[PDB]
Design a binder for this molecule. Structure first.
Ligand SMILES: [Mg+2]
Ligand SMILES: [Mg+2]
Lengths: 197, 106, 122, 127, 61, 167
RNA sequence: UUGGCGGAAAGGCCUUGGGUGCUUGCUGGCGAAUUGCAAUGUCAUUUUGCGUGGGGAUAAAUCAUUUGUAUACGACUUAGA
RNA sequence: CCCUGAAAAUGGAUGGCGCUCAAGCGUGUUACCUAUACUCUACCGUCAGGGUUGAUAUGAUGCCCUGACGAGUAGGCAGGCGUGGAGGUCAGUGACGAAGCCUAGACCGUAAGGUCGGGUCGAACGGCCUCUAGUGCAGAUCUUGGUGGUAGUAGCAAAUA
RNA sequence: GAAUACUGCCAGCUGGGACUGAGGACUGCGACGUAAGUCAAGGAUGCUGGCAUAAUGGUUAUAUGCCGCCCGUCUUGAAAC
RNA sequence: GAAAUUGUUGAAAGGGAAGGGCAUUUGAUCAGACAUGGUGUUUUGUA
């Protein structure tokens, strides 16, 4: 339905979002995921830190350089979870994976575009209230990501600029709604209301 | 106007397959808009064209067409089964494809 | 035929690392080049547009001797000689043009469409 | 110009080749059955080559027919060609490979007079 | 799959069309197979089966 | 001899086919096609154009016209499986369509020798069109916006689901 | 064309002024056929070459020689109008 | 149900990703996916049961109708393909080119194989009915002969120059 | 005093879709008809268009999806370290 | 004057083998049918 779909990753569950997105890429939809530092994983922070340490133990014994690579950024953690669900070793899998780019924060190509959510992977819609969850940025900076604060500063600046945008947009739409209400109850308005618009 | 589309867009998903054996004679098509077999029953018997391009001009055109039709619904989510004169080349998994509205019955 | 030979700086001209100076091969090849240039001037060629158009080397029958190895054994000691041939030609101009006619087949719908375009525009 | 026939169907148009004829040069690709005790081809495992069997047999109304619709009949001279005088719509002549050109012109002339189809009217012809 | 109660594709085990290449014997079995097919007498069927028999199954009388 | 002989030759006489039992009953059209219906042409040269349906012909085809003054579609025949019968209805009583039949549209088939290397209309056809369309447009002028509706083309926009759309 | 803003991967967003074209906001006039009952019925963007005619600028690297802070050979570090 | 009890050696496996009002556990209801299995149809073969010497034209081991059946090592049987030589026949092919060889060119047969076109070549060879055998190769650390990768590699360094 | 659910029946009507068209003078069982005859009754016909050529197709190379362990032998068991 | 094996030219593919099966795309290459008897003589060489 869309050329590129921009997904705001905030408040989403990692596995459910990855299983949605992998099927979208295999069907041929182009997906870009922004704000990867705000993904959520169900479970305690200590459980997921222990899980990452169990993953971090695994390496090739005779040469650590050819072993499993333990990527530390939240976007690369999401990429790992998604590459697990795409059959990446085939040409179809590579062609699917080249339709995806995942970012921490919202870069300047995508800060002026529209962000969507996936309601079947949202934490507030999936988890029972009371279950504990993690933040992927906190887990990733606990296991070695170096750029948690610069992303926070850039996101603060971007949010200030976006609020400055939204004030003007709200004023303009209030003018347009006022003019539409005053130009209603004419004959064309009543004919459109009879016809359903 | 600015739009001239008289077909419905669809995606070529895969072949008919088991877990480890595929069957290229039957293709699986996701028609956009339909999400149930009862709505997919409208599209049975409709013609499908896969339209692609080539470098070498054959009979006045560089655009080649592969024709087929919808035969039955597939699953619970509005995917349909489609058969073509020559089977789809399997590099078109995820490629766009056109479902026309003829043969009509409305 | 370059495995386990030494590496050198003079392969940078050809983008390789492994290069050598086969003096005997150069002597034989340049003798054949001189003979071909002599044949070309005898035939009456320009002697300034000549480039080596063809050259090939393949194997002559081997010449065998013997080698004496430990615990009283015999092995072979064989020379691998060469047959060499080469052809020098004048560098000519551009080869040809004016390709095939490519007769076209159009349906009635295509012909009507082209006629409609020719009518509808100028 | 042939007799009407049903649509000719080949159940297996691909040539049956011997296992590992692609692998070794000493193994020719004429078909031999694998009689080995562990042979995957003999045991008919999935993904291996198929074997010739009687189920691939051509239709008896369609068997031995050329795509033109005739059966090939080898001829060597005019007397062999004349046997197909009353059976032109079912048989088509084929000149044998060892016939000279000055006889081939005679056989082609007589076949054109009798209305007989020749399947190789271009062998040893000079132009 | 069929649970077969018998041997599939087995021959009847009774000799027809005798193994000899005698042309006069073949003419005789042609005459008597016509007679056994159409005269509806048991004698013709009996002598037609007796014409197929081998030498040790035809002792001298 | 190269090949010996066949011991038996097959007979060259062609047999006759058996006596068939496939009679021709007439076509039973679908219920939404009544004469005077506005159709949408799904395929063809005039695809996406809205025309009016006049008469069911002999070879199961539908006689349609634009009218030619409105959208430039002449008197024509179309296939019933390649149109959409919209609910918009005009009355075509007062039009004498019994003149047209299957022999009225003849192509005058071309020989194999006449090949168009690089590259007209019947006067009987053009005043027949002029007779019928002036009777149609008088019925068109009664309800508003039909001339504009028939002049405009049909196309599917983003978000149009044809299994949910009513025509 | 005037003025800004945007460095996370800015390469885009906003704005001033005039020109020019269209306007289906409303009412008219002319054209369309024959692609013959359908045939994607061809309208997109990606790279390169060759021509025009209009600007723009007039280098280095390697081999060879040399060095020994380097070195199995390559490689490295130096020097040489 | 969960937890403690619960310690092994390369890094690690509910198949993996991952999953927490589950994508876990117990249970129930529907819809859906697909085996060479089942149903129907076509075709091939096998087996069985039948029909059909009438004239014309052939083949009665022929033609035709009906039904069922088809896995397979060791092994048995049947019908065929191919090779050297022999009797007969085609008053067979051939220096206007036999045999052989090459050919991601064509045709026929389920297959063993057969046929044709092109190139090369230079003197004999083939179809059919029969007879005969020193008659069909991927293997035997097979025999003889030829040729590779290894590989321009190991190396060509004792006896003062 | 009713309705509806549930289950079951109809030799009730009717719409859409897919695959197949074997056989080749006639013979049979039937149906509608007073009759001539007709029919969906022992297997597909009717109408129309385009092309008439590498377009369909065959072969071959490559690409893609899924599958595919090295043969022969002894062995209860071989891809076997 | 075969094959193993090799050189040149041409075409093609190549991210820790290669080769194969089913299916189709793409490129290259290729066979067959295309007259037919026919009302007919709009006809020349008049049949
Ligand atoms: Mg020595
Ligand atoms: Mg081989």
């Amino acid at each position: 339905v869309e050329p590129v779909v921009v997904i705001d990753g905030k408040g989403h569950l990692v596995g459910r979002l990855a299983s949605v997105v992998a099927k979208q890429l295999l069907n041929g939809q182009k997906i870009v995921v922004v704000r990867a530092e705000e993904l959520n994983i169900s479970g305690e922070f200590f459980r997921n830190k222990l899980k990452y340490h169990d993953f971090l133990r695994k390496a090739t014994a005779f040469n650590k350089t050819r072993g499993p690579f333990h990527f530390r950024a939240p976007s690369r953690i999401f990429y790992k979870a998604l590459r697990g669900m795409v059959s990446h070793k085939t040409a179809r899998g590579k062609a699917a994976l080249e339709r995806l780019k995942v970012f921490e924060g919202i870069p300047p190509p995508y800060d002026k575009k529209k962000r969507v959510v996936v309601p079947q992977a949202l934490r507030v819609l999936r988890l029972k209230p009371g279950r504990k969850y993690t933040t992927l940025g906190k887990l990733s900076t606990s296991v070695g990501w170096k750029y948690e604060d610069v992303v926070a500063k850039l996101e603060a600046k971007r949010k200030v600029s976006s609020a400055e945008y939204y004030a003007k947009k709200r004023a303009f739409t209030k003018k347009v709604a006022s003019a539409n209400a005053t130009a209603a109850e004419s004959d064309v308005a009543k004919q459109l209301a009879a016809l359903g618009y | 106007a600015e739009s001239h589309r008289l077909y419905v867009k669809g995606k070529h998903l895969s072949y008919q397959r088991s877990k480890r054996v595929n069957n290229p004679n039957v293709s699986l098509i996701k028609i956009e808009g339909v999400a149930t077999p009862q709505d997919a029953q409208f599209y049975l018997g409709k013609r499908i064209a896969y339209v692609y391009r080539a470098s070498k001009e054959v009979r006045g055109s560089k655009i080649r067409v592969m024709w087929g039709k919808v035969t039955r619904t597939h699953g619970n989510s509005g995917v349909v089964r489609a058969t073509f004169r020559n089977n789809l080349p399997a590099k078109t998994f995820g490629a766009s494809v056109r479902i026309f509205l003829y043969p009509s019955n409305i | 035929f370059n495995s386990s030979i030494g590496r050198t700086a003079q392969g940078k001209e050809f983008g390789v690392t492994k290069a050598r100076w086969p003096a005997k091969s150069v002597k034989f090849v340049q003798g054949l080049l001189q003979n071909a240039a002599a044949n070309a001037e005898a035939k009456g060629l320009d002697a300034t547009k000549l480039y080596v158009s063809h050259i090939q080397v393949n194997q002559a029958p081997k010449q065998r001797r013997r080698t004496y190895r430990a615990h009283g054994r015999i092995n072979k000691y064989e020379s691998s000689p060469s047959h060499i041939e080469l052809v020098v030609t004048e560098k000519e101009e551009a080869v040809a043009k004016a390709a095939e006619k490519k007769v076209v087949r159009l349906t009635s719908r295509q012909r009507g469409r082209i006629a409609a375009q020719k009518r509808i525009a100028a | 110009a042939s007799l009407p026939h049903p649509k000719i169907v080949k159940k297996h148009t691909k040539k049956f080749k011997r296992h590992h004829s692609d692998r070794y040069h000493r193994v020719a690709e004429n078909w031999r059955k694998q009689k080995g005790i562990d042979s995957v081809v003999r045991r008919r495992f999935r993904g291996n080559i198929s074997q010739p069997k009687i189920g691939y047999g051509s239709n008896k109304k369609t068997k031995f027919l050329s795509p033109s619709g005739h059966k090939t009949f080898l001829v060597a001279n005019v007397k062999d060609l004349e046997t197909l005088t009353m059976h032109t719509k079912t048989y088509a002549a084929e000149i044998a490979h060892n016939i000279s050109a000055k006889n081939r012109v005679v056989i082609l002339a007589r076949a054109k007079a009798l209305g007989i189809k020749v399947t190789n009217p271009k062998g040893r012809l000079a132009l | 799959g069929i649970d077969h109660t018998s041997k599939q594709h087995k021959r009847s085990g009774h000799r027809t069309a005798p193994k000899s290449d005698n042309v006069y014997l073949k003419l005789l079995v042609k005459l008597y197979t016509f007679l056994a097919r159409r005269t509806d007498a048991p004698f013709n069927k009996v002598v037609l089966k007796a014409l197929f028999l081998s030498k040790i199954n035809r002792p001298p009388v | 001899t190269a090949q010996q002989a066949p011991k038996w030759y097959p007979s060259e006489d062609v047999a006759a086919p058996k006596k068939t039992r496939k009679a021709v009953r007439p076509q039973k059209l679908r219920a939404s096609l009544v004469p005077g219906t506005v159709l949408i042409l799904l395929a063809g040269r005039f695809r996406g154009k809205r025309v009016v349906y006049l008469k069911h012909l002999e070879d199961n085809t539908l006689l349609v016209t634009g009218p030619f003054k409105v959208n430039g579609v002449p008197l024509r025949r179309v296939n019933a499986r390649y149109v959409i019968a919209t609910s918009t209805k005009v009355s075509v009583e007062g039009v004498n369509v019994e003149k047209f039949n299957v022999e009225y549209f003849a192509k005058e088939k071309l020989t194999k020798k006449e090949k168009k290397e690089a590259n007209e209309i019947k006067t009987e056809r053009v005043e027949d069109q002029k007779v019928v369309d002036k009777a149609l447009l008088a019925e068109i002028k009664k309800t508003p916006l039909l001339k504009q509706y028939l002049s405009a083309s049909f196309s599917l926009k983003n978000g149009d689901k044809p299994h949910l759309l009513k025509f």
